[PDB]
Amino acid sequence: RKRRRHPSG
Amino acid sequence: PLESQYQVGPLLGSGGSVYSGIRVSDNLPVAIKHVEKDRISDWGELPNGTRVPMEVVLLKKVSSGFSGVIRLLDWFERPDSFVLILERPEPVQDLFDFITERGALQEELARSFFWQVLEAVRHCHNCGVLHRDIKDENILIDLNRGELKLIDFGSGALLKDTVYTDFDGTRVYSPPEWIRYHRYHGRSAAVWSLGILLYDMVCGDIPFEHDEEIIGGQVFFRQRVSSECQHLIRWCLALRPSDRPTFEEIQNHPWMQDVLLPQETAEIHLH
Ligand SMILES: Cc1ccc(/C=C/C(=O)O)cc1
Numbered sequence: 001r002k003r004r005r006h007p008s009g
Numbered sequence: 010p011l012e013s014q015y016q017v018g019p020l021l022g023s024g025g026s027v028y029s030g031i032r033v034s035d036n037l038p039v040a041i042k043h044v045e046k047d048r049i050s051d052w053g054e055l056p057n058g059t060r061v062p063m064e065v066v067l068l069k070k071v072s073s074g075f076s077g078v079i080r081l082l083d084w085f086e087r088p089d090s091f092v093l094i095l096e097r098p099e100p101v102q103d104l105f106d107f108i109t110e111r112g113a114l115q116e117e118l119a120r121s122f123f124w125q126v127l128e129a130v131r132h133c134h135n136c137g138v139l140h141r142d143i144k145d146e147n148i149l150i151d152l153n154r155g156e157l158k159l160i161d162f163g164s165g166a167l168l169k170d171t172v173y174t175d176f177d178g179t180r181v182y183s184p185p186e187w188i189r190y191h192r193y194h195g196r197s198a199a200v201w202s203l204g205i206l207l208y209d210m211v212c213g214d215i216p217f218e219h220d221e222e223i224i225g226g227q228v229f230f231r232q233r234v235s236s237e238c239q240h241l242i243r244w245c246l247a248l249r250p251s252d253r254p255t256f257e258e259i260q261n262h263p264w265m266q267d268v269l270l271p272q273e274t275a276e277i278h279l280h
Contacts, residue, residue: 003109006146006180007024009177
């Protein structure tokens with residue numbers, strides 16, 4: 001399954 | 010002159026903008042971070058009384074000495090931006106990429122990393138600084154030394170004991186009291202994000218993706234995780250903030266005993 005980064009804000 | 014003290018090189022990343030560089034004075038590897046004044050939300054003042062971005066204020070408060078925190082080595086003001094000169098370990102990989110490439114970490118390695126993150130956050134709090142964006146993306150691994158370094162204080166704040174009503178960190182690491190009420194206290198919110206981080210290390214990805222999962226209070230383990238480690242994770246992710254462990258209780262937890270030293274960690278797991 002998709003592991004992704006997450007932006008801050 | 011900033012442009013005469015440092016040889017500027019390749020863009021390391023952005024999302025301000027961070028360039029690899031070398032201090033001309035002694036060939037020291039540095040990272041050079043540019044932040045546009047127009048895009049700065051929180052401002053502070055230093056001892057000089059100069060108005061600087063809060064990120065600069067927080068970096069100076071934690072950069073005294075050696076730590077698992079990135080050291081601010083210098084800064085410059087420009088017409089429309091500030092420029093920060095930071096330490097650059099080499100060779101380095103950030104913890105997000107490391108977990109992507111390796112998958113779920115062995116508990117022995119996650120113990121060593123988590124412990125080092127706890128010591129770095131304790132250092133921040135001792136210096137009066139709340140990071141507010143603890144996550145694997147904001148953690149560098151010095152692959153030769155086995156040492157972790159906390160980076161990116163651009164969403165942090167001075168540590169206080171009263172309620173916070175603003176937040177600009179990463180929502181999937183933010184606690185349920187923020188999701189539901191737009192309020193949180195500093196240390197217990199930090200502990201929540203550390204539970205998310207620990208799960209991320211031993212399972213290979215963060216547990217929650219949507220608001221309803223964050224407030225839902227159910228932690229499903231998708232990998233084999235020891236009962237002691239599951240207990241610590243579930244304790245850090247207690248829905249009520251006052252039910253979460255303190256940093257002392259985390260570090261006294263039975264899953265945390267007999268940590269590897271950084272050098273042992275590099276030799277067994279990183280070399
Ligand atoms: C490789 C590297 C990447 C990033 C930093 C610092 C960034 C920050 O404090 O936001 C330092 C080194």
